[PDB]
Short mmCIF file of C-alpha atoms in Angstrom, two decimals:
data_model
loop_
_atom_site.label_atom_id
_atom_site.label_comp_id
_atom_site.label_asym_id
_atom_site.label_seq_id
_atom_site.Cartn_x
_atom_site.Cartn_y
_atom_site.Cartn_z
CA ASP A 28 0.00 0.00 0.00
CA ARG A 29 2.72 2.44 -0.97
CA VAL A 30 0.22 4.11 -3.29
CA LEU A 31 -1.75 5.28 -0.27
CA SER A 32 1.22 7.41 0.79
CA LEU A 33 1.39 9.18 -2.56
CA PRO A 34 -0.68 12.37 -2.86
CA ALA A 35 -4.18 11.24 -3.75
CA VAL A 36 -4.95 14.31 -5.82
CA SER A 37 -3.81 13.49 -9.33
CA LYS A 38 -1.48 15.41 -11.57
CA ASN A 39 -4.51 15.81 -13.79
CA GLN A 40 -6.57 17.33 -10.99
CA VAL A 41 -3.81 19.81 -10.29
CA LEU A 42 -3.62 20.89 -13.92
CA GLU A 43 -7.36 21.38 -14.09
CA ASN A 44 -7.59 23.32 -10.83
CA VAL A 45 -4.59 25.53 -11.53
CA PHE A 46 -5.38 26.08 -15.22
CA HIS A 47 -9.13 26.21 -14.78
CA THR A 48 -10.00 28.95 -17.31
CA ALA A 49 -8.36 29.64 -20.65
CA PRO A 50 -6.78 33.06 -20.07
CA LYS A 51 -7.70 36.15 -22.05
CA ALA A 52 -5.21 37.05 -24.76
CA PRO A 53 -3.67 40.55 -24.72
CA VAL A 54 -4.48 41.08 -28.38
CA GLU A 55 -8.09 39.93 -28.30
CA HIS A 56 -9.15 43.30 -26.94
CA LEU A 57 -7.38 45.12 -29.75
CA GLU A 58 -8.63 43.02 -32.65
CA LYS A 59 -12.19 42.99 -31.27
CA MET A 60 -12.51 46.71 -30.63
CA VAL A 61 -10.69 47.57 -33.85
CA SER A 62 -13.15 45.59 -35.95
CA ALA A 63 -15.96 47.33 -34.09
CA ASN A 64 -14.45 50.77 -34.46
CA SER A 65 -13.98 50.08 -38.14
CA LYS A 66 -17.77 50.27 -38.26
CA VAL A 67 -17.61 53.56 -36.35
CA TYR A 68 -15.17 54.74 -38.99
CA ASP A 69 -17.35 53.57 -41.86
CA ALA A 70 -20.60 55.08 -40.77
CA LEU A 71 -19.45 58.25 -39.11
CA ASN A 72 -16.30 59.74 -40.57
CA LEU A 73 -17.04 62.04 -43.62
CA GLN A 74 -14.23 60.46 -45.62
CA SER A 75 -15.53 56.90 -45.62
CA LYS A 76 -16.98 55.36 -48.71
CA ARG A 77 -20.13 54.45 -46.75
CA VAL A 78 -21.00 57.40 -44.56
CA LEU A 79 -24.40 57.71 -43.02
CA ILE A 80 -24.42 61.49 -43.33
CA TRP A 81 -26.33 61.48 -46.61
CA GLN A 82 -28.72 58.87 -45.33
CA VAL A 83 -29.63 60.52 -42.05
CA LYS A 84 -29.42 64.21 -43.01
CA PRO A 85 -30.34 64.40 -46.68
CA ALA A 86 -28.67 67.20 -48.57
CA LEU A 87 -30.51 70.29 -49.69
CA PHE A 88 -29.86 70.68 -53.38
CA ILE B 26 -42.93 57.19 -33.30
CA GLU B 27 -40.22 58.11 -30.81
CA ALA B 28 -41.52 55.46 -28.44
CA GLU B 29 -41.86 52.86 -31.18
CA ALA B 30 -38.36 53.48 -32.49
CA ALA B 31 -36.87 53.38 -29.02
CA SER B 32 -38.69 50.10 -28.46
CA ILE B 33 -37.53 48.65 -31.78
CA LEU B 34 -33.94 49.69 -31.18
CA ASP B 35 -33.70 48.31 -27.65
CA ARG B 36 -35.06 45.01 -28.87
CA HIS B 37 -32.40 45.12 -31.59
CA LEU B 38 -29.52 46.24 -29.37
CA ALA B 39 -30.07 43.09 -27.31
CA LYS B 40 -29.28 40.85 -30.18
CA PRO B 41 -25.87 39.57 -31.21
CA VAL B 42 -24.63 40.96 -34.50
CA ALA B 43 -24.75 37.66 -36.35
CA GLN B 44 -28.46 37.39 -35.60
CA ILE B 45 -29.10 40.94 -36.80
CA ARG B 46 -27.38 40.65 -40.16
CA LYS B 47 -29.23 37.47 -41.07
CA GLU B 48 -32.58 38.60 -39.70
CA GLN B 49 -32.30 41.63 -41.95
CA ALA B 50 -30.92 39.81 -44.98
CA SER B 51 -33.77 37.33 -44.66
CA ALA B 52 -36.24 40.19 -44.51
CA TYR B 53 -34.60 42.05 -47.38
CA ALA B 54 -34.47 39.04 -49.67
CA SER B 55 -38.03 37.94 -48.92
CA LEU B 56 -39.24 41.42 -49.82
CA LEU B 57 -37.34 41.45 -53.11
CA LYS B 58 -38.90 38.23 -54.33
CA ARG B 59 -42.32 39.57 -53.45
CA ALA B 60 -41.50 42.27 -56.00
CA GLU B 61 -39.85 39.86 -58.43
CA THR B 62 -42.59 37.23 -58.51
CA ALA B 63 -45.10 40.01 -59.13
CA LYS B 64 -45.46 39.73 -62.90
CA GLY B 65 -45.46 43.07 -64.68
CA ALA B 66 -47.35 45.04 -62.05
CA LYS B 67 -46.63 48.76 -62.03
CA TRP B 68 -45.78 48.78 -58.34
CA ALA B 69 -43.29 45.95 -58.77
CA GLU B 70 -41.41 47.65 -61.60
CA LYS B 71 -41.35 50.83 -59.54
CA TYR B 72 -40.17 48.84 -56.51
CA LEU B 73 -37.18 47.36 -58.31
CA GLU B 74 -36.48 50.67 -60.03
CA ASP B 75 -36.07 52.22 -56.60
CA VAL B 76 -33.79 49.43 -55.43
CA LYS B 77 -31.65 50.35 -58.43
CA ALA B 78 -31.87 54.00 -57.38
CA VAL B 79 -30.79 53.27 -53.82
CA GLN B 80 -27.78 51.42 -55.21
CA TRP B 81 -27.03 54.47 -57.32
CA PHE B 82 -27.13 56.58 -54.16
CA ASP B 83 -24.71 54.30 -52.37
CA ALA B 84 -22.43 54.25 -55.41
CA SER B 85 -22.56 57.99 -56.06
CA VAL B 86 -21.60 58.66 -52.44
CA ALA B 87 -18.69 56.22 -52.67
CA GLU B 88 -17.25 58.25 -55.55
CA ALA B 89 -17.07 61.49 -53.52
CA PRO B 90 -18.21 61.30 -49.90
CA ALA B 91 -17.46 64.86 -48.88
CA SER B 92 -19.56 66.00 -51.86
CA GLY B 93 -22.51 63.66 -51.52
CA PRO B 94 -24.60 62.27 -54.35
CA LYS B 95 -24.06 63.68 -57.82
CA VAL B 96 -26.92 65.75 -59.15
CA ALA B 97 -27.19 67.06 -62.68
CA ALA B 98 -26.05 70.67 -62.57
CA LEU C 23 9.83 -2.04 -16.56
CA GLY C 24 9.36 -1.84 -20.32
CA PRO C 25 8.24 1.70 -21.13
CA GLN C 26 9.67 2.85 -17.82
CA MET C 27 13.22 2.11 -18.90
CA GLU C 28 13.56 5.72 -20.05
CA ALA C 29 12.61 8.87 -18.19
CA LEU C 30 9.47 10.93 -18.57
CA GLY C 31 11.07 13.62 -20.65
CA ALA C 32 13.80 11.52 -22.20
CA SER C 33 12.12 9.33 -24.78
CA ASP C 34 11.69 9.83 -28.50
CA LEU C 35 7.90 10.04 -28.28
CA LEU C 36 6.18 13.27 -27.36
CA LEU C 37 5.41 13.64 -23.67
CA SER C 38 1.67 13.20 -24.13
CA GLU C 39 2.19 10.00 -26.06
CA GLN C 40 4.72 8.79 -23.51
CA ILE C 41 2.33 9.33 -20.59
CA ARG C 42 -0.01 6.97 -22.45
CA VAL C 43 2.47 4.11 -22.67
CA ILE C 44 3.59 4.56 -19.07
CA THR C 45 0.00 4.56 -17.83
CA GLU C 46 -0.97 1.59 -19.98
CA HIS C 47 2.01 -0.23 -18.48
CA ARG C 48 1.74 0.65 -14.80
CA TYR C 49 -2.03 0.24 -14.51
CA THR C 50 -4.87 -1.77 -15.93
CA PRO C 51 -7.89 0.10 -17.36
CA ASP C 52 -9.93 -0.80 -14.25
CA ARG C 53 -7.82 1.49 -12.10
CA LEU C 54 -8.38 5.06 -11.01
CA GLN C 55 -4.85 6.04 -11.93
CA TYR C 56 -5.26 4.72 -15.44
CA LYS C 57 -8.18 7.10 -15.86
CA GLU C 58 -6.30 9.98 -14.25
CA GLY C 59 -3.26 9.24 -16.36
CA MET C 60 -5.00 9.20 -19.69
CA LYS C 61 -6.70 12.45 -18.74
CA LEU C 62 -3.28 13.94 -18.05
CA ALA C 63 -2.20 12.82 -21.49
CA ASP C 64 -4.97 15.03 -22.85
CA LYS C 65 -3.82 18.06 -20.89
CA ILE C 66 -0.33 17.56 -22.25
CA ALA C 67 -1.52 16.95 -25.81
CA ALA C 68 -3.47 20.18 -25.43
CA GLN C 69 -0.18 21.87 -24.55
CA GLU C 70 1.50 20.29 -27.56
CA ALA C 71 -1.08 21.66 -29.96
CA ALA C 72 -0.69 25.10 -28.39
CA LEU C 73 3.08 24.74 -28.78
CA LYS C 74 2.81 23.53 -32.35
CA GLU C 75 0.60 26.48 -33.24
CA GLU C 76 2.89 28.95 -31.48
CA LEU C 77 5.91 27.71 -33.41
CA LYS C 78 4.13 26.92 -36.68
CA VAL C 79 4.56 30.56 -37.72
CA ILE C 80 8.37 30.20 -37.61
CA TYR C 81 9.71 26.68 -38.13
CA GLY C 82 7.16 25.65 -40.73
CA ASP C 83 4.61 22.87 -40.48
CA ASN C 84 7.04 20.04 -39.72
CA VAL C 85 7.89 21.99 -36.60
CA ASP C 86 9.35 19.05 -34.60
CA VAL C 87 7.45 19.90 -31.45
CA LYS C 88 9.29 17.18 -29.49
CA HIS C 89 12.51 19.23 -29.51
CA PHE C 90 10.80 22.32 -28.12
CA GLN C 91 8.67 20.49 -25.60
CA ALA C 92 11.74 18.92 -24.02
CA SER C 93 14.03 21.95 -24.29
CA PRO C 94 12.10 25.18 -24.88
CA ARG C 95 13.79 28.04 -26.63
CA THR C 96 15.62 30.56 -24.50
CA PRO C 97 14.70 34.29 -24.49
CA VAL C 98 17.62 34.76 -26.89
CA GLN C 99 16.28 32.19 -29.33
CA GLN C 100 12.81 33.72 -29.16
CA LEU C 101 14.56 36.94 -30.19
CA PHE C 102 16.43 35.43 -33.12
CA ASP C 103 13.28 33.77 -34.41
CA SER C 104 11.56 37.13 -34.27
CA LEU C 105 14.33 38.76 -36.29
CA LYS C 106 14.58 36.00 -38.86
CA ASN C 107 11.02 36.57 -40.01
CA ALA C 108 10.75 40.33 -39.43
CA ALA C 109 11.53 41.28 -43.03
CA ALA C 110 8.64 39.14 -44.25
CA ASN C 111 6.53 40.50 -41.37
CA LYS C 112 7.09 44.17 -42.13
CA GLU C 113 6.41 43.49 -45.79
CA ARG C 114 3.26 41.48 -45.08
CA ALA C 115 1.90 44.33 -42.97
CA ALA C 116 2.70 46.83 -45.71
CA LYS C 117 0.95 44.67 -48.28
CA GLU C 118 -2.04 44.37 -45.94
CA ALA C 119 -2.22 48.05 -45.01
CA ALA C 120 -2.23 48.92 -48.70
CA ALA C 121 -5.22 46.64 -49.31
CA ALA C 122 -7.07 47.38 -46.08
CA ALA C 123 -10.63 48.54 -46.61
CA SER C 124 -10.26 51.97 -44.99
CA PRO C 125 -7.56 54.22 -43.50
CA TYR C 126 -8.72 53.26 -40.04
CA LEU C 127 -7.89 49.62 -40.66
CA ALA C 128 -4.68 50.51 -42.47
CA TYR C 129 -3.37 52.29 -39.38
CA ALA C 130 -4.58 49.45 -37.21
CA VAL C 131 -2.64 46.76 -39.04
CA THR C 132 0.54 48.79 -38.87
CA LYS C 133 0.18 49.84 -35.24
CA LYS C 134 -0.42 46.23 -34.28
CA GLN C 135 2.61 45.12 -36.27
CA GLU C 136 4.71 47.97 -34.87
CA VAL C 137 4.08 46.45 -31.45
CA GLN C 138 4.18 42.81 -32.51
CA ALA C 139 7.44 43.00 -34.47
CA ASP C 140 9.38 44.57 -31.61
CA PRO C 141 10.97 41.63 -29.75
CA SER C 142 10.99 43.56 -26.50
CA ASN C 143 7.18 43.22 -26.42
CA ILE C 144 7.15 39.42 -26.24
CA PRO C 145 5.53 38.65 -22.87
CA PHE C 146 7.82 36.52 -20.75
CA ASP C 147 5.83 35.01 -17.89
CA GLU C 148 9.02 34.58 -15.89
CA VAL C 149 9.85 38.27 -16.28
CA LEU C 150 6.28 39.41 -15.68
CA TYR C 151 5.30 37.11 -12.80
CA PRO C 152 8.48 35.82 -11.14
CA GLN C 153 6.71 34.20 -8.20
CA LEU C 154 4.38 32.39 -10.58
CA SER C 155 7.02 30.78 -12.76
CA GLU C 156 8.96 29.61 -9.73
CA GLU C 157 5.77 28.04 -8.39
CA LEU C 158 5.01 26.46 -11.73
CA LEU C 159 8.48 24.98 -11.42
CA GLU C 160 7.71 23.61 -7.97
CA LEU C 161 4.64 21.85 -9.30
CA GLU C 162 6.87 19.50 -11.26
CA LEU C 163 9.65 19.48 -8.71
CA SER C 164 7.13 18.43 -6.08
CA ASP C 165 5.68 15.73 -8.33
CA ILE C 166 9.18 14.28 -8.70
CA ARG C 167 9.94 14.66 -4.99
CA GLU C 168 6.90 12.54 -4.21
CA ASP C 169 8.36 9.85 -6.46
CA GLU C 170 11.70 10.17 -4.71
CA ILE C 171 10.21 9.78 -1.24
CA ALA C 172 8.51 6.62 -2.50
CA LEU C 173 11.89 5.19 -3.49
CA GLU C 174 13.61 6.23 -0.28
CA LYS C 175 10.93 4.39 1.66
CA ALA C 176 11.30 1.32 -0.52
CA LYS D 12 -24.19 45.30 -16.43
CA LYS D 13 -21.85 48.23 -15.94
CA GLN D 14 -22.44 47.91 -12.22
CA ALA D 15 -21.97 44.14 -12.30
CA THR D 16 -18.67 44.65 -14.10
CA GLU D 17 -17.65 47.31 -11.59
CA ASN D 18 -18.61 44.90 -8.83
CA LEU D 19 -16.56 42.11 -10.39
CA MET D 20 -13.59 44.38 -10.96
CA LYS D 21 -13.83 45.56 -7.36
CA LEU D 22 -14.07 41.97 -6.21
CA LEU D 23 -10.99 40.93 -8.17
CA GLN D 24 -9.20 43.86 -6.59
CA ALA D 25 -10.32 42.66 -3.18
CA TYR D 26 -9.06 39.18 -3.97
CA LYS D 27 -5.71 40.63 -5.00
CA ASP D 28 -5.42 42.82 -1.93
CA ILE D 29 -6.19 40.27 0.78
CA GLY D 30 -4.04 37.71 -0.97
CA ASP D 31 -1.13 40.13 -1.09
CA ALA D 32 -1.63 41.18 2.51
CA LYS D 33 -1.40 37.52 3.52
CA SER D 34 1.60 37.28 1.13
CA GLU D 35 0.48 33.86 -0.05
CA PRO D 36 1.80 32.13 -3.16
CA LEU D 37 -0.21 32.45 -6.34
CA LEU D 38 -0.64 28.76 -7.16
CA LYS D 39 -0.89 27.55 -3.57
CA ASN D 40 -4.63 27.79 -3.02
CA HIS D 41 -5.54 26.70 -6.51
CA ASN D 42 -3.47 23.57 -6.00
CA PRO D 43 -5.66 20.96 -4.30
CA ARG D 44 -2.56 19.08 -3.16
CA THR D 45 -2.04 21.77 -0.56
CA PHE D 46 -5.40 21.02 1.05
CA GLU D 47 -4.68 17.31 1.22
CA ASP D 48 -4.06 15.70 4.59
CA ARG D 49 -0.90 13.62 4.56
CA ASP D 50 -1.28 12.69 8.23
CA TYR D 51 -4.54 10.85 7.73
CA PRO D 52 -4.77 7.45 9.47
CA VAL D 53 -4.40 5.61 6.05
CA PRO D 54 -6.68 2.52 6.15
CA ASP D 55 -4.87 -0.81 6.13
CA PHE D 56 -6.11 -3.27 3.52
CA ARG D 57 -5.16 -6.24 5.67
CA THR D 58 -7.96 -5.46 8.12
CA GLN D 59 -10.79 -5.03 5.60
CA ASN D 60 -11.40 -8.65 4.42
CA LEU D 61 -10.56 -8.28 0.74
CA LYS D 62 -10.59 -11.12 -1.74
CA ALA D 63 -8.19 -11.53 -4.68
CA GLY D 64 -9.33 -8.95 -7.15
CA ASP D 65 -10.65 -6.57 -4.51
CA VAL D 66 -7.51 -4.77 -3.33
CA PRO D 67 -7.02 -2.33 -6.26
CA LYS D 68 -10.64 -1.25 -5.95
CA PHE D 69 -9.97 -0.69 -2.25
CA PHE D 70 -6.97 1.46 -3.13
CA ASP D 71 -8.97 3.52 -5.60
CA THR D 72 -11.67 4.44 -3.12
CA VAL D 73 -9.18 5.36 -0.42
CA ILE D 74 -7.47 7.63 -2.92
CA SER D 75 -10.59 9.10 -4.48
CA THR D 76 -12.08 9.71 -1.06
CA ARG D 77 -8.93 11.48 0.09
CA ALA D 78 -8.77 13.41 -3.19
CA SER D 79 -12.43 14.41 -3.00
CA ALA D 80 -11.88 15.53 0.56
CA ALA D 81 -9.01 17.73 -0.58
CA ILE D 82 -11.00 19.27 -3.39
CA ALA D 83 -13.94 19.85 -1.03
CA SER D 84 -11.48 21.39 1.41
CA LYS D 85 -10.27 23.71 -1.34
CA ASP D 86 -13.88 24.70 -2.00
CA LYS D 87 -14.30 25.49 1.68
CA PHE D 88 -11.25 27.74 1.47
CA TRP D 89 -12.51 29.68 -1.51
CA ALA D 90 -16.05 29.95 -0.20
CA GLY D 91 -14.62 31.53 2.93
CA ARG D 92 -12.25 33.67 0.92
CA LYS D 93 -15.15 34.93 -1.19
CA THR D 94 -17.04 36.29 1.81
CA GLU D 95 -13.83 37.87 3.04
CA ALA D 96 -13.33 39.72 -0.24
CA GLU D 97 -17.02 40.50 -0.76
CA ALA D 98 -16.92 42.28 2.58
CA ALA D 99 -14.02 44.43 1.41
CA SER D 100 -15.56 44.78 -2.04
CA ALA D 101 -18.38 46.70 -0.39
CA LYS D 102 -15.93 49.25 1.07
CA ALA D 103 -13.82 49.79 -2.01
CA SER D 104 -12.53 52.62 -4.19
CA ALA D 105 -14.18 52.09 -7.63
CA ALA D 106 -11.90 54.49 -9.51
CA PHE D 107 -11.22 52.46 -12.61
CA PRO D 108 -10.15 53.74 -16.02
CA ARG D 109 -12.75 53.55 -18.75
CA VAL D 110 -12.64 51.58 -21.96
CA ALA D 111 -11.12 53.68 -24.72
CA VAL D 112 -13.83 54.12 -27.34
CA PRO D 113 -13.73 56.77 -30.06
CA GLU D 114 -15.43 59.98 -29.03
CA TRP D 115 -18.77 60.41 -30.78
CA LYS D 116 -20.97 63.41 -30.07
CA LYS D 117 -24.71 63.54 -30.71
CA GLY D 118 -25.02 64.92 -34.22
CA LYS D 119 -21.34 65.16 -35.03
CA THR D 120 -18.93 62.84 -36.77
CA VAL D 121 -15.88 60.89 -35.67
CA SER D 122 -12.46 62.13 -36.69
CA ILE D 123 -9.77 59.71 -37.73
CA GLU D 124 -7.37 61.54 -35.45
CA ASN D 125 -9.49 60.25 -32.57
CA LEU D 126 -10.03 56.77 -33.96
CA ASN D 127 -6.26 56.50 -34.18
CA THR D 128 -5.42 57.69 -30.67
CA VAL D 129 -7.94 55.15 -29.46
CA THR D 130 -6.10 52.48 -31.44
CA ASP D 131 -2.89 53.71 -29.83
CA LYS D 132 -4.43 52.95 -26.45
CA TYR D 133 -5.19 49.40 -27.53
CA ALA D 134 -1.68 48.80 -28.81
CA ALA D 135 -0.09 50.43 -25.77
CA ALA D 136 -1.57 47.71 -23.59
CA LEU D 137 -0.15 45.05 -25.87
CA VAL D 138 3.27 45.88 -24.40
CA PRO D 139 3.98 43.99 -21.17
CA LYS D 140 4.17 45.80 -17.85
CA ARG D 141 7.70 44.46 -17.31
CA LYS D 142 9.72 43.29 -20.27
CA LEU D 143 13.14 42.07 -21.30
CA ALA D 144 15.04 44.78 -23.13
CA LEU D 145 15.93 42.36 -25.91
CA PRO D 146 18.25 44.38 -28.16
CA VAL D 147 17.96 44.29 -31.90
CA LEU D 148 21.21 45.32 -33.51
CA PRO D 149 20.35 48.30 -35.74
CA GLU D 150 21.83 48.59 -39.19
CA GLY D 151 23.45 51.83 -38.02
CA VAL D 152 25.78 49.82 -35.80
CA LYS D 153 25.69 46.42 -37.49
CA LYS D 154 27.35 47.91 -40.56
CA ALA D 155 29.78 50.06 -38.55
CA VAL D 156 31.11 46.78 -37.11
CA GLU D 157 30.76 44.73 -40.29
CA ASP D 158 32.92 46.95 -42.47
CA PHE D 159 35.40 47.45 -39.62
CA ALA D 160 35.88 43.71 -39.97
CA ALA D 161 35.83 44.11 -43.75
CA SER D 162 38.52 46.81 -43.60
CA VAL D 163 40.74 44.24 -41.87
CA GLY D 164 39.60 41.71 -44.47
CA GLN D 165 37.18 39.44 -42.59
#
């Protein structure tokens, strides 16, 4: 019964209690806000090819 | 109208973006084929003539966005 | 001994596929420690996919992940693998910023590459969190020490 | 949701404060080996009337009981740690920086000189808070030492 003197908690159960959650990448905040601010650029810039300024305030000609 | 639009928007702001783009593309495409299966009716030719005129507006703005759409002057 | 004639890190198989032949040898499938050993072989094969993908961008597709699992690359070799692809990285970003859809995205793919191509920005967990990487060392030094107390008792 | 996120960020500050006041290791309390009792009375299989194939199943349920009682002792640590930090979360500072979004007024537009300084704030957090100053050799000094060896003829 030498196995009953070994630590009963497995090496697996250490690696799933220490590494419980997949950690958040540093770059996943950049490349997720950048793709969402690229829609703020598109709609709201005045130099974009798809501005909403002629759709929401139609021009007086 | 202010209360309807604020109710429509807050129902729409609670959706994920992938749901929104395919709810609207389903509604846009279903409404085109209601104008395309309409054989020769005057409202259906005028419907699809205005879809061609919206796509002119989006294309004329893409050519010069600080100018706007191009009018004949 | 069979599979246990060579150490845990010192075979020719990858460590996840060596844990499988040690656990199949020491235990029968009935056992608890067979089940906890084959689950550990999944946590290590998960770390070998995340090491293959991290080094796929440098050493190719035949990356030989066994060499870098056993002996990881030093902070100087992480530097010289940054610099040996930087000319094709600064030219890929310039070919992508030219064909980005808008001048917001064109600045965003150069500002990200201006940070990502600098080798001083590589996050070293041992430099960042020194108490963490010593304690991640004493998770494997304490797993070995429990196998060395079992042989001193024997 | 903004208040739930300010509550969570104040809670994770309370966890970091009362774990750095107690000066504890980072991986210690997430390791369930540290909540295991090694001085348990360790039941002897020679006093439990086992038949031939019954001893490894006895060993598995002495282990998996003692492992479940270490996990459930880790849960009792963290459930008592939570109420210790939730008490200090209620008395906290709540002066956090805000997420950098591009400034958009009510009827106005968004300048690209503000979309770009927002993107600078995203790529200034991609640098690590403590980094190795891994030196690239510039071409301004890698040629001033290459031709100095080429003037000698190397």
